[PDB]
């Protein structure tokens, strides 16, 4: 039961472990964006670089009520929008020289354009592409390259049209449920996503992550010394299971040797009185 309890609590550790990682991951992402923002504030301000547009979020505004919808739909709203290849390359290597973060970039010169005209969307489903109000229409086509088949459904009608109707599209439910065309089973959960376009912030203090790491370390140390005690008890049990049979065999051979000595003693004790009587009858002879 001891080691049972051990595994029990160590299972808890694993849970804590992964959940901590989750928080850590989020924190990293957060801090990543933060330092990314620094570049967006610094590299564009110095004027030494040109053609730097910024981020995809620094563009046309969408309705605020669909913030969770667009947050769960695509994170690529955080993509770095630039135009020329060489400027992007040089700032990438300048950022990597000092290790100032990590993100994705897109080039306007290689942006494949398409037709941004709307299509017939039956069953009264709104298209988020028309809802966006871009300040620069020249990028709207790029939006069609990013927001491909962007629709919105509700009232659980996804099983009729979004599953398979006239054509399957990347429809995002008002609450955040997304059905992808790729077919893979999107595992749901309880992850939060909001605060990407104002017409959310789940940041925690670094001391909280520090105390989580400290409690993880102390739990790991406690479980390690518990496993050490379990190993010591297992070694003691092995010592007992080795000391049982050798002692039983030694007591068997000891009782056998004692029986042999007793038989020898019984057969030899008659010689005592035999030799005593012989010596007496020899001493009594005194004629010579």
């Amino acid at each position: 039961s001891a080691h049972l309890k051990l595994k029990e609590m160590q299972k808890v550790l694993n849970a804590h472990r992964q959940r901590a990682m989750e928080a850590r991951s989020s924190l990293s992402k957060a801090q990543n964006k933060s330092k990314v923002l620094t570049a967006l504030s610094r590299l564009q301000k110095s004027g030494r670089i040109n053609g730097f547009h910024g981020r995809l979020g620094d563009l046309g505004v969408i309705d605020d009520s669909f913030d969770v919808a667009i947050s769960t739909a695509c994170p690529r709203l955080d993509d770095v929008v630039v135009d020329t290849v060489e400027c992007a390359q040089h700032c990438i290597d300048y950022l990597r020289k000092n290790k100032l973060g990590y993100a994705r970039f897109i080039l306007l010169d290689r942006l494949r354009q398409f037709n941004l005209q709307p299509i017939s969307t039956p069953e009264n489903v709104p298209r988020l592409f028309d809802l966006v109000k871009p300040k620069n229409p020249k990028f709207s086509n790029a939006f069609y390259s990013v927001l491909r088949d962007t629709l919105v459904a509700q009232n659980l009608k996804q099983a009729n049209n979004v599953a398979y109707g006239k054509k399957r599209f990347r429809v995002v439910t008002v609450d955040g449920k997304l059905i992808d065309i790729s077919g893979t089973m999107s595992g749901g959960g309880n992850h939060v996503a909001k605060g990407l376009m104002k017409l959310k912030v789940d940041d925690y203090t670094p001391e909280e992550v520090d105390k989580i790491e400290r409690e993880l370390s102390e739990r790991e140390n406690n479980f390690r010394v518990a496993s050490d005690t379990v190993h010591e008890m297992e070694e003691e049990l092995k010592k007992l299971r080795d000391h049982e049979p050798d002692l039983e065999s030694q007591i068997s051979k000891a009782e056998m040797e004692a029986d042999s000595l007793a038989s020898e003693l019984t057969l030899a004790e008659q010689q005592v009185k035999e030799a005593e009587m012989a010596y007496v009858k020899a001493v009594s002879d005194k004629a010579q």
């Binding site: 472990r17 950022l95 077919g183 042999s260």
Partner: protein, 243 residues
């Protein structure tokens, strides 16, 4: 000793861990092959491409394989979903191949600085189609300028990966920055796991043959009682020689 001193590395290999609750006991758990991470390995030279490898899988490193569609859907529905993940069934995933003609043409245009994704991985044959769905659409180029001129080629639409971790998408998409390389520890972890499984199977076979030998030894002790009786008779006769 090995399985007790090698868990300081487990603190880093945590996101690849699989967790679930069995919805249906009658369902065959063999259909859930597991996470795609430990289901395949990488050869030695992939170390020189280690970082690049992450890109070639991306978040796809955290997918779980299921046999068919209905079982995957019911496991997702009744499995008490806790975190947003991605699951791949095997029955409905389409395999989109790439014409090897453009592949060899790009290999001949750029001599030496060309690598194929499916040629730099080691996996099971029964899931080769899965590799055609994930690792069957990417390429690797060493020099950055070569990958840049390959990306700008109209016919050569190559999903290139520059060794510094630079994804050269055929549509001009490019990444960059310092993330890190969490594949070497996962490789060590799965190697330790496979050697632990081998040693455990060997020890289980040894324990089974030991139980057989223990039954034979129970019979041999049944006769060894009389053997000890004869040994005691021998000792008594040896004592009576000089008695």
């Amino acid at each position: 000793q090995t399985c007790k001193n090698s868990e300081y590395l487990k603190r880093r290999v945590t996101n690849l861990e699989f967790n679930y609750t069995k919805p249906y006991p009658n369902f065959e758990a063999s259909f859930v092959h597991g996470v795609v991470g430990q289901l395949f390995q990488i050869d030695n030279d992939n170390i020189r491409y280690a970082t690049a490898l992450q890109t070639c899988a991306g978040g796809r490193l955290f997918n779980v394989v299921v046999q068919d569609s209905q079982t995957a859907t019911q496991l997702l529905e009744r499995g008490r979903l806790r975190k947003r993940v991605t699951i791949i069934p095997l029955d409905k995933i389409y395999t989109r191949p790439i014409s090897s003609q453009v592949l060899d043409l790009a290999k001949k245009i750029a001599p030496g600085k060309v690598e194929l994704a499916i040629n730099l991985i080691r996996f099971d044959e029964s899931i080769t189609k899965a590799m055609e769905f994930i690792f069957g659409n990417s390429l690797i180029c060493e020099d950055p300028e070569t990958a840049k001129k390959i990306t700008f080629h109209p016919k050569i639409r190559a999903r290139s990966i520059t060794l510094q971790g630079d994804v050269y998408d055929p549509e001009g998409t490019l990444s960059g920055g310092s993330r890190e390389s969490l594949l070497v520890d996962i490789q060590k972890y799965n190697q330790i796991q496979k050697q632990i499984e081998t040693i455990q199977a060997d020890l289980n076979h040894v324990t089974e043959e030991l139980q057989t030998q223990y039954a034979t030894s129970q019979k041999t002790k049944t006769i060894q009682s009389d053997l000890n009786l004869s040994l005691h008779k021998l000792d008594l006769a040896k004592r009576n020689l000089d008695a």
